[PDB]
Amino acid sequence: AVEHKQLRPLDVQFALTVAGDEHPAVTLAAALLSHDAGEGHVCLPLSRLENNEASHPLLATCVSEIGELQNWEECLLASQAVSRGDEPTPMILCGDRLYLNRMWCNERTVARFFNEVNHAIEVDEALLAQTLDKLFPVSDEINWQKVAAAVALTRRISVISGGPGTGKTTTVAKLLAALIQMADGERCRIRLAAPTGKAAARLTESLGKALRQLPLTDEQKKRIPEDASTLHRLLGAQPGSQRLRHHAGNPLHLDVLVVDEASMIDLPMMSRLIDALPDHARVIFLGDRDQLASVEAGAVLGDICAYANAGFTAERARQLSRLTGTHVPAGTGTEAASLRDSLCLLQKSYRFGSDSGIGQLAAAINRGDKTAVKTVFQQDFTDIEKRLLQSGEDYIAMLEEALAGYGRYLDLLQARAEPDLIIQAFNEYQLLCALREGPFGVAGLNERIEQFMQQKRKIHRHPHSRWYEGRPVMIARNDSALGLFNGDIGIALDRGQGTRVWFAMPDGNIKSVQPSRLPEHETTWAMTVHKSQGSEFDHAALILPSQRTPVVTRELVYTAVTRARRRLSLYADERILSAAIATRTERRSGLAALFSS
DNA sequence: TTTTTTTTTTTTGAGCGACTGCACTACAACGTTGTAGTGCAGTCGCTCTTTTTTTTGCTGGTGGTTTT
Numbered sequence: 144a145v146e147h148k149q150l151r152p153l154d155v156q157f158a159l160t161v162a163g164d165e166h167p168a169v170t171l172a173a174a175l176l177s178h179d180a181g182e183g184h185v186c187l188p189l190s191r192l193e194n195n196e197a198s199h200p201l202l203a204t205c206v207s208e209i210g211e212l213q214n215w216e217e218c219l220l221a222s223q224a225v226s227r228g229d230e231p232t233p234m235i236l237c238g239d240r241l242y243l244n245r246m247w248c249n250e251r252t253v254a255r256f257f258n259e260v261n262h263a264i265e266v267d268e269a270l271l272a273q274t275l276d277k278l279f280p281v282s283d284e285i286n287w288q289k290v291a292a293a294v295a296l297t298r299r300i301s302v303i304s305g306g307p308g309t310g311k312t313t314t315v316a317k318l319l320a321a322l323i324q325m326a327d328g329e330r331c332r333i334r335l336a337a338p339t340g341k342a343a344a345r346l347t348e349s350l351g352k353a354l355r356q357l358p359l360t361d362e363q364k365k366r367i368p369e370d371a372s373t374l375h376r377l378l379g380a381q382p383g384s385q386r387l388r389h390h391a392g393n394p395l396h397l398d399v400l401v402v403d404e405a406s407m408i409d410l411p412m413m414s415r416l417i418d419a420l421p422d423h424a425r426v427i428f429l430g431d432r433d434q435l436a437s438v439e440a441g442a443v444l445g446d447i448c449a450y451a452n453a454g455f456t457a458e459r460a461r462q463l464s465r466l467t468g469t470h471v472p473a474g475t476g477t478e479a480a481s482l483r484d485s486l487c488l489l490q491k492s493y494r495f496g497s498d499s500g501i502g503q504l505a506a507a508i509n510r511g512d513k514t515a516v517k518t519v520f521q522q523d524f525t526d527i528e529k530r531l532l533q534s535g536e537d538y539i540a541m542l543e544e545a546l547a548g549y550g551r552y553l554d555l556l557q558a559r560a561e562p563d564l565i566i567q568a569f570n571e572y573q574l575l576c577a578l579r580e581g582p583f584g585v586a587g588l589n590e591r592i593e594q595f596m597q598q599k600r601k602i603h604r605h606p607h608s609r610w611y612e613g614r615p616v617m618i619a620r621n622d623s624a625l626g627l628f629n630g631d632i633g634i635a636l637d638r639g640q641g642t643r644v645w646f647a648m649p650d651g652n653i654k655s656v657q658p659s660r661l662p663e664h665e666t667t668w669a670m671t672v673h674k675s676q677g678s679e680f681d682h683a684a685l686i687l688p689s690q691r692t693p694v695v696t697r698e699l700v701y702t703a704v705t706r707a708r709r710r711l712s713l714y715a716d717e718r719i720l721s722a723a724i725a726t727r728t729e730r731r732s733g734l735a736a737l738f739s740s
Numbered sequence: 741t742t743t744t745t746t747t748t749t750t751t752t753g754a755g756c757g758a759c760t761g762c763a764c765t766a767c768a769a770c771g772t773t774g775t776a777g778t779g780c781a782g783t784c785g786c787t788c789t790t791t792t793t794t795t796t797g798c799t800g801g802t803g804g805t806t807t808t
Contacts (some may be wrong), residue, residue, distance in 0.1 A: 146741070182741095338744065375745045382746045407744075438743050578741075621745070629744080673742045694741050 144693060147178055154178045161224050161233055162542040168202035171220045172215075173234065176241055183440045185250060185410060185732035186240040189215040189261045239552030240733050246440075247733075249414035251618070253443065254737040261300040261481050263457065264425070266325060266553065268466055271296065271584050274321040275467065277624045278357075282730050283297060285469055292318040292488040293466040294459075298485055299425045302405070304432040304448045305489030306505065307679065307705045310344075311429060314489075315401060316353035323363055325430050332394070335371035336402040336416075340621050342677040346403050347360040348649040371403070374412055387415065390418075394421035402679065410441025431705070433509055435676065442730035450479065451486040459484045461474070487531045494708070500524025502708055508701045519713075530715040533689070533694035541686070541714050542595050548572040548712075549681060553601050556613050556636070562645040565634055569615060570647075573680040575671035575703050576687075583688035588669040610658050612636050617670075619663035627657060630668055630674060672699050675706060684709035687715035687723070695719065696728045 154177035162170040173211060175196075176187050193199060193215060201264035203213070212218040219225035219236050219736060226232040237249035242250070242372035264295065271293065279289045295301040296320050323331055333483060335350070337343035344676045347370055354367060379388030389395050398429040402408070402416070405428040421427065430446040434464070454474015455463065463471040479736065495502045500518060504527060519529050532541060546553075556666060578584035604611040614635050618627050626648065627633075633644040643655045660665070669686065685703040687695050700723055713720075 340745080373745060379748085380746050382749080388748085409744085412744085435742090438745095574800095623747090672771070699742090714795070 144182075146693060146696060150174065150178060151181060154181065162222070165222050165224065166202065166206055166218070167198070168206065168215075168218055169224060171198055172219065172241060173203065173224070176234065176243065177413060178439050179731070180243060183436060183442065183730050185244050185246055185730060185734075186443055187606060188731060189236075189239050189241065190266045192241075192613070200601055207545040209544075214352045231366060234705045238491060238733060238736050240731075240736070242733065246410065249410050249441075250733050250737070252414045252417055253410070254734060257300065257447065257482055257484075257485075258479070258738065261298060261485055264297065264299055264421070271321065271325060272466055272468055274324045275317075275526070278317045278320055282468075286467075287487070287489050287491055288314040288317070289467050290463055290471060291489065292321060293411070294487055295427050296322055297462070297466065299427075300381070301485050301487070302444070303487050303489070304430065304444075304449055304451055306431050306492065308494035308502075308708070309489045309492045310494075311489070312353055315427070315429065316350060316357065319350075319354070319368070319399075319401075320357050320359075323366055330398070331366055332396065332398045333366070333368040333398045334377070334400045336374055336377055337371050338374055338404055338407045338412075339630065339677060341371055341630040342404050343373060344628060344649045346371040346679060359730070366466075374402075374408070374416060378415055387419070389419045390415075393417055395424075397421075397424050397426070399425045399456055401427045401429065403429040405444045406434040407437055407676065408443055409437035409439040410443055411439065412556075413441070413443045430467060433698065433701050434705075435673065435702045436728055436730065438673075442636070443732070446732050446734040447482070448486060449735070450483050451480070451488050453483055454485055456480045458468065482738055498524070499709070500526045501704065501709070501711060503525075504711075505704045508704060508724060510671065511516055515720070515724060526709060527711050528715045530718070532686070533716065535701075537714075538591075542591070544712065545574065545592070545684070546572075546595075546599075546601075548684065556602075562634060562636060562638070562655075563647070566645065566647045566653070569634060571681040572684075573675070573682070574684050574686060575672050575675055575706060576669045576685075577672060577692065577699065578688060579671070581688075583686065583690075584671055585665075587688065589666040592668045608643050610635060611641060615667045616661070616664040618661065619665060622662050625662075626654065626659065626686065627656075630678065633661075650695070672702055676702065677734070678706075679708060681708045682710040682712075684712035685714065687713075687719055689716060689719065691719065695723045696726050697724050698728055700724065 154174045157177045158170045160172040161173050172187075175192060179187050202218075206212040206218060208221070210217060212221065216236060216239065217235070219241065219347060220227070224232055225234045225236050225241070228235055228237055231244075233244055235242055235244050237247070237620070275289055275293060279286060279292075281289075291303050291305075291314055295303060303314065304310065305314075314480055318334060322333075335346055336344075337346055350368065350371075361368075378390075381387075400420070407430075408416075422719055428447075430444050432451065433444065434444075436442050436445070453476065454472065456477055457473050459480070460471050460473035477483075492502055498505065500523065504515060504518045507518045527652055530541065531537060550570075552565065554574070555565045555568050569703065574588065575583055578590055580586050593604065594622070597604055602611070602613050611634065616633050616635060618629060618633075621627075621629050627646055631646060633646040633656070635642055635644045637643075638655065642658065644658055644661065646653055646654045646656060683706045684704065685700070702719070
């Protein structure tokens with residue numbers, strides 16, 4: 144890539160410290176490995192290092208041995224920095240892929256967790272089928288949620304892959320209801336994990352409103368899960384040290400663990416969660432397959448769910464047909480039966496069907512760009528609009544359409560109404576941009592919207608006050624004392640006691656906080672796609688820059704499409720949207736070779 | 741080029757010198773035994789200051805703060 148050529152000083156200093164007085168081949172390999180680990184690639188194949196490097200004949204002529212060091216494996220193993228996994232070396236080369244020692248340890252831990260410990264819990268099939276028939280009312284055709292709940296309650300470790308609006312939380316509620324109704328006398332300490340606090344709050348309110356609907360008992364309501372915790376808070380991560388409370392000696396005293404949003408879970412946090420689990424806990428992972436990658440280096444959920452396209456096994460198809468009582472198809476071939484059995488694919492979306500163009504566009508994002516052009520082209524399904532953004536008049540037209548997007552918000556702001564309706568009207572329309580600074584970014588679009596509200600008589604703003612009535616703010620760091628998490632929106636207005644910011648709590652109430660008590664506050668007229676994950680908006684509008692950037696890729700446009708409930712607008716060029724679909728954010732990892740053997 | 745989380749403390753005196761108890765042999769009183777002197781080991785008090793010393797250019801010299 145363009146960023147991969149501009150070498151960071153960290154990779155150069157790491158290569159000069161690790162290699163030192165060794166050959167320049169080890170220096171170039173360590174620099175390329177550190178640069179690929181900085182971008183998020185877990186493994187480094189030796190074929191790319193051999194072919195796509197111009198210094199390869201130079202390093203071939205620099206080495207001098209009896210065997211001449213023609214292979215990269217002998218040249219790396221001749222140095223004291225690369226071993227086969229026995230000596231405590233920083234770099235590990237085992238399967239013709241060079242990685243770091245920590246990444247190799249976490250990759251082998253994930254492969255051992257998903258290849259060996261995932262055994263089959265044998266339960267009664269008749270009572271499970273009766274609970275699935277009494278919980279799921281649809282029994283006429285094939286329902287993927289029933290098969291997902293059956294394959295999650297059958298095996299210990301299970302991964303549920305599904306997009307937004309497909310009823311994943313209802314599937315988790317039916318799964319937990321059948322889990323408690325199956326084991327009556329056995330105690331079940333259900334635990335819920337989330338990577339972020341706002342997604343944890345959404346998970347708590349969604350599972351509460353899903354489990355209060357289903358009929359339970361007096362002892363069944365006692366075994367309701369209490370709360371969803373952060374992954375740093377469940378394992379006991381400290382700010383100063385990396386020492387965990389449940390690292391390797393005492394595991395977490397849990398029975399079943401549901402980890403929501405596994406797409407934002409990186410490889411070290413996944414390995415630290417795996418090392419904390421006991422030998423009897425059953426873990427259910429949630430997340431989308433085609434969603435955006437993790438925050439730090441690593442891609443766990445994508446490399447897990449890459450084998451979901453092959454299908455199930457021959458025996459597992461008959462097992463699912465005996466459990467669900469319907470016709471479950473089988474997958475052709477068998478490469479890894481445990482991982483292909485533990486996976487599932489959700490295709491039937493309940494909040495949107497084939498009549499809406501949003502789901503068809505989300506299905507056409509993973510396909511070629513001409514499928515997306517055909518999806519936007521014919522009749523637009525009264526849901527998706529596309530506006531070309533090339534010059535300043537297109538920018539003025541985009542701001543004019545954003546005026547109509549925030550029209551109900553400004554109407555409720557000018558009419559001096561209750562703040563709850565103001566927050567409910569603001570949570571229906573949302574702009575999503577890629578970058579932060581410049582003319583195309585967060586700070587550009589926020590300042591342009593503030594200048595446009597200063598121009599037209601819609602929002603009065605004092606230049607020296609910085610806390611005018613009607614500014615939307617968002618928090619950047621968590622604050623458990625105030626009850627607000629990262630990614631929560633607040634609207635500043637004057638109720639009569641002064642300019643205070645109202646936040647919409649997930650418990651149904653509204654909280655008025657002083658702006659002096661806010662730890663962080665950033666203007667949120669246009670959110671980044673990485674920071675808008677977990678939330679949902681009724682009318683989303685994606686804005687992509689004209690300059691080519693590695694942020695705008697297939698998963699970014701997919702998360703921008705799946706962010707919209709009903710209406711979605713686009714402001715991008717044709718060439719940028721055509722090139723962003725083909726350029727997929729691939730992350731090289733050794734999971735595809737370890738799961739194939 | 742984007743971005744995630746997190747609130748639990750800990751530990752710290754040792755050498756010098758005496759008190760007391762049990763073992764251990766030397767030697768005189770009545771072969772054996774009681775009294776005396778010393779060695780070794782467990783247990784315990786105790787105790788660890790005091791303080792102040794200065795040259796630096798007021799504007800030393802074409803120097804000089806502030807409004808359009």
